[PDB]
Amino acid sequence: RDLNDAQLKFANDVESRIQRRIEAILSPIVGNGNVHAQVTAQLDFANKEQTEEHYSPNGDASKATLRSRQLNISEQVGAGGPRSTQRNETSNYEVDRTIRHTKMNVGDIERLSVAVVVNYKTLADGKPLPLTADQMKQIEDLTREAMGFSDKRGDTLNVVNSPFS
Amino acid sequence: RDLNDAQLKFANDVESRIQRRIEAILSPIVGNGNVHAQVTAQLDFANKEQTEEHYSPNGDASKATLRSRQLNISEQVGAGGPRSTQRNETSNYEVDRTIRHTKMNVGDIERLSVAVVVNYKTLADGKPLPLTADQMKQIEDLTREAMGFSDKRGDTLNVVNSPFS
Amino acid sequence: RDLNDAQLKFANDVESRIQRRIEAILSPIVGNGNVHAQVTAQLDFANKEQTEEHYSPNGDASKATLRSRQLNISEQVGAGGPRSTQRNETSNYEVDRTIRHTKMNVGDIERLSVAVVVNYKTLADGKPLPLTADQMKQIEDLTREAMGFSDKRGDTLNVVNSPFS
């Protein structure tokens, strides 16, 4: 089981780099040792390939390309009446064509979850007090930008403020 | 039975890493030695392959691509009446096509279950008392983010608060 | 897992170069050590190929090229009346054609996120005060130009002003 052992080490490095990035950005604002963050990562390890072929529509006559055409009219009016109208048409077309071949990578990030806790000092000498809502929102925005939120990917973030021991 | 012996070791490492992650995040809030967590993991070890082929629909004329077409009208009005309308049409199309080949990985996580117990101190010198509902909710959210909840996957979490010995 | 280890190092260099560029441009305005910035990057590592083939339309007669043509009129007026008009036409065309083959690069930037924090001095000796809106807008514009905003790509920027410790 050598493959699984190496895979676990790779996932540890991804989380380690993100963890210290959040610590570094928030360290000056709150303090050197008043922030803690833990990051868990889910990685895709499957091998995938994809081939796509697309054709541009040519229903409209203005945007159509023709290689050959045949077109015959027959029309006989009779009096003394009959009207034997007749029409035949054959058309050949040259169409646009696009092909993309994609071989995806192994080790991408599928989803991330980060939890951050901050301390209660709030004062030089008085009793600890909760932080302001605006400051909490600023901290949330900064850690969100640091970690790389993507709503469509499915990221989750949770930050709580509580006293330390 | 060398394969099964190595498989058991791999499952132990996955649970070990998750266990200390929950301990580290919750250690400052409650204390150094006032938290205990145990993690059990179910791993998929089957070999799977999959091939998918998809075609884009072309029922609508506006989004259709044509290589050739034949179309003949015949229409004879007679008087003295008969109306022998006739129509023939033959069409050929060029269709989009996409192929993905996927070879899945061995050793993924199918489901996780974690149980966490926290202590009763609640006071410097008085008798132990239960923790607050808000603090319990914060602890639950933090451990959920640390462990990586996924509702569709089937994860289960249970946290209880009780005295220690 | 040697490929993933090297990939992580490459992403670190991209963020490192951008980080010091923002620091250098904003250093004289605010101060030597009154600015902090952290950059996270998402890189595409997939292998992709694409082939495109396009044909210019030739529906209009003025912009059409002909290699051969056949065209026969028959028209019989009878009196004592019948009018047996008849028309046949066959046309061949020479069409324009363009082919581009593209092999994309590996390691491009898909999206960037930067968070910047600035300090409160605002005075030589008095209490710290918030910076002006115009100065904040100037700082935002300068860091945006330094980092390389692209609206269609999906870039995100967040700058907040708060006291330091």
Numbering used by the authors:
A (entry chain A), B (entry chain B), C (entry chain HA): 228 to 307, 354 to 438
How is this structure described in the published paper?
A central part of the bacterial flagellar motor is the MS-ring, which is composed entirely of multiple copies of the FliF subunit. Major functions of this ring are to support the assembly of the switch and to stabilize the assembled motor. Starting at the N-terminus, each FliF protomer begins with a predicted transmembrane helix, TM1, followed by a set of domains termed ring-building motifs (RBMs). From the N-terminus, these include RBM1, RBM2, and RBM3, with RBM3 further divided into RBM3a, a ß-collar, and RBM3b.
MS-rings containing 33 subunits represented ~80% of the population (49,944 particles). The 3D map of the 33-mer RBM3 had an average resolution of 2.9 Å, with local resolutions between 2.6 Å and 3.4 Å. We therefore built an atomic model into this map. At a global level, each RBM3 appeared to exhibit the same fold as previous models. However, an overlay of our structure with that reported by Johnson et al resulted in an RMS deviation of 1.2 Å, which is greater than would be expected for two structures of identical sequence at ~3 Å resolution. We therefore evaluated whether the RMS deviation could be artificially high because of a difference in angle between the β-collar and RBM3. As a minor note, residues 395–401 of RBM3 in the 33-mer were associated with clear density but were not included in the previously published models. The correlation of these densities with the stabilization of RBM3 residues 395–401 potentially suggests an architecture with discrete membrane-spanning domains.
